[PDB]
Structures are given as C-alpha cells and as structure tokens.
Amino acid sequence: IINKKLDLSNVQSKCGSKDNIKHVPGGGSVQIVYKPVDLSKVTSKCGSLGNIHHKPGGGQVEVKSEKLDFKDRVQSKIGSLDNITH
Amino acid sequence: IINKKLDLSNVQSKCGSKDNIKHVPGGGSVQIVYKPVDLSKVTSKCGSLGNIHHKPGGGQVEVKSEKLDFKDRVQSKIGSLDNITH
Amino acid sequence: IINKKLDLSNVQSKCGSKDNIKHVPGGGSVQIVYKPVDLSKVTSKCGSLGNIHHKPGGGQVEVKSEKLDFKDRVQSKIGSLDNITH
C-alpha cells in the first residue's frame, strides 16, 4: 500500500447551523442576526501595468424607524417558549 | 494498491442549515436574519494594460417605517411555542 | 505501508453553530448578534507596475430609531423561557 495526497483544500463543515433564533417582543423591537457563511478563494495575478480591483459587496442591513408611538399599554405574558422533554 | 490524490477543492457542507427562526411580536417589530451561504472562487489574471473590475453585488436589506401608531393596548399572551417531546 | 501527505489546508469545523438566541423585550429594544463565519484564502501576486486593490465589503448593521414614545405601561411577565427536561 502506498497512500499519497496533497491536501490544498478549503473546508467549512457544519458551520453556522442549528441556530435557534427567537424574537418575542411586546412591541417596538428589532432583532438582527447577521450570520453569513462565506468561503472565498481569490488568486489575483497582476503583471505589466494592469489593474485588478476586487471589491465584491458585503451584506448591508438597515432598519429605520422615523416615528413610532404606543398610546396604551404594551404587555407580554409568557408562560414558556420552546419546551423540550425526553 | 497505489492511492494518489491532489485535493485542491473548496467545500461547504451542512452550512447554514436547520435554523429554527421564530418571530412572535405583539406589534411594531422587525426580525432580520441575514444568512447567505456563499462559495466564491475568483482567479482574475490581468496582463499588459488591462483592467479587471470584480464588483459583484452584496445583499441589501432595508426596512423603513415612516409613521406607525398603536392607539390601544398591544398584548401578547403565549402559553408556549414549538414544543418537542420524546 | 507508506502513508505520505502534505496538509496545506484551511478548515473551519462546527464553528458558529447551535447558538440559542432569545430576545424577549417589553418594548423599545434592540438585539444584534453579528456572527459571520468566514474562511478567506487570498494569494495576490503583483509584478512590474501593476496594482492590486483587494477591498471586499464587510457586514454593516445599522439600526436607527429617530422618535419612539410609549405613553402607558410597558410590562413583561415571564414564567419561564425555553425549558428542557430529561
């Protein structure tokens, strides 16, 4: 037996997975979970008088509330969330 | 037996999966989960007086509320969410 | 048996996973979890009078509240969240 390898790889495995995300407001509330999973391989080669511009966009999340009024009671009653049992 | 490999690969496996995402507001509420799974391989080669511009767009999420009024009670009563049992 | 390898790899495994994220406000509240999982390999080679600009965008999260009024009681009553039992 001869076993020979060159492992020049890039791996993401089970990344960013099985997140349990809950937002349970009375009111007037923001939850942002920003969770991209990105694998980038970039091999720019630039000779002579060339130019390479490598400027791929990122994620933008904008939430704007200009006016927001609650004129009576904001009320949450929670007995539980998300039960598990075995 | 001779086993020979060159592994020059890029892999994402089980990434960004099985997320449990819940939004249960009374009112006037934003949940953003920004979760792209992106694999990019880019091999720009630029000789002489060439130009390469590599500017693919990113994700944009915009939420705008200009005016929002609740003139009476905003009320959530939750006994549970999302039960599991074995 | 001959076993020979070159391991020149990049690995992320089980990273950023199984987060349990809860936001349970009465009102007027922001939760941001900024949790990208990023693997970047960059091999820029620049000869002669070339230029390489490598400027990929990052994540931007902006939350703006310009005006926000609660004119009566903001009230949360929680018996529990997220029970587990064995």
Numbering used by the authors:
A (entry chain B), B (entry chain C), C (entry chain A): 277 to 362
Which sentences did the original study use to describe this structure?
The formation of amyloid filaments through templated seeding is believed to underlie the propagation of pathology in most human neurodegenerative diseases. A widely used model system to study this process is to seed amyloid filament formation in cultured cells using human brain extracts. Studying templated seeding in cultured cells, and determining the structures of the resulting filaments, can thus provide insights into the cellular aspects underlying neurodegenerative diseases.
Although the resulting filament structures differed from those of the brain seeds, some degrees of structural templating were observed.
